[PDB]
Ligand SMILES: O=c1ccn([C@@H]2O[C@H](COP(=O)(O)OP(=O)(O)O)[C@@H](O)[C@H]2O)c(=O)[nH]1
């Protein structure tokens with residue numbers, strides 16, 4: 192049960208989120224689900240831990256109820272004395288899921304809804320779909336922008352941001368990115384994608400792909416498939432928009448409920464890419480030079496976004512206007528320079544690395560330089576898998592040079608390369624007979640590459656946090672703005 196209205200009983204709220212009420216029961220007025228730092232009077236705050244200071248601030252802000260997993264110190268007795276209701280839960284994700292359900296019901300019930308998930312591409316696809324809709328003058332909400340990606344049930348950010356926009360606009364579309372494989376510290380939050388998708392009750396679920404990543408949370412691509420498939424099992428109506436070219440997203444068609452139509456995109460599909468262009472129902476839709484200097488992933492995400500919008504009955508001409516005006520997210524195959532061609536891509540797992548190298552080689556006239564930052568403090572296995580992907584993708588390619596770096600000079604302590612991580616990465620390159628140069632510092636790797644390259648070469652920069660600072664370093668050494 193999900194109530195309608197601006198009042199609840201504290202014991203009812205506790206029941207809705209699977210918690211126990213600490214304090215005296217009472218009818219409360221409710222504002223929105225919020226963070227403690229932004230809370231307005233009568234808001235409900237979900238925060239997986241609290242302490243006595245948080246209780247005092249909640250009292251000062253007239254928060255209606257605090258929902259938490261871990262009341263530190265004397266928080267419980269203090270809150271009882273202050274009459275700050277505490278609802279104690281064991282899994283905060285259920286409270287955050289209820290907050291989404293309740294916020295949709297009370298603030299944006301008359302909406303078409305898309306959930307987008309997948310290992311790579313889900314933020315870009317979400318961003319593209321959102322852009323197509325708002326560029327068309329539709330009122331829409333999304334949980335991802337150029338600066339943030341609030342795609343979990345760990346906190347109430349989705350419910351809060353949705354409520355804040357729904358109070359100002361008559362929303363027609365919700366475009367929600369859902370984390371398919373989500374960690375709580377070092378532990379996989381099993382069924383997260385199912386729970387979060389079910390909380391949204393979407394009309395369309397988009398699954399971009401299934402790929403190895405988040406090693407430690409998962410070990411096998413089968414596990415990624417199982418967790419990601421939760422979003423498709425959650426779908427009770429409408430359309431499953433599935434990548435036909437990925438074998439595991441293809442497998443998800445068998446998992447759809449009876450009243451769900453599968454909509455495949457990819458090779459030999461109604462929405463497809465071929466002969467340098469994107470085709471819809473065999474009509475040339477987006478042309479080659481309307482997609483300049485673009486990645487394979489950029490194309491596949493566009494196919495996904497087209498397919499999602501077609502399932503929402505957006506007219507093709509409006510879809511096209513959106514695509515041609517789309518502004519991509521940071522370090523998504525970003526063209527930093529044209530002479531030499533410098534490409535800055537956040538590739539960070541085997542599929543993304545292979546995609547980035549092949550797409551860069553497609554655009555390369557003479558020599559291809561690949562500058563790659565090891566993925567610090569993410570474990571030996573992911574760095575071994577990544578070096579393996581880099582090596583297998585390049586071994587057939589002619590006229591390349593590999594430059595590996597630890598980026599010791601720019602990463603923070605949570606992203607430092609460990610000795611065992613550098614070792615497995617470099618030893619894998621050698622195993623595949625890939626010649627390479629290595630530099631502890633990103634800055635030296637960039638300076639040496641730009642010095643030795645020719646104006647006809649291509650420089651591809653790949654890496655997550657280890658390569659994030661590269662563009663500002665490139666301006667400092669006066670390579671950019673070229
Ligand atoms: O809302 C949640 C969900 C998960 N966890 C943590 O993440 C682990 C993974 O939880 P999961 O749902 O996979 O299953 P469980 O471990 O409870 O059997 C849990 O044991 C907790 O340590 C948590 O603290 N809050």
Ligand SMILES: [Mg+2]
Pocket residue numbers: 311312315488489523
């Ligand atoms: Mg991408």
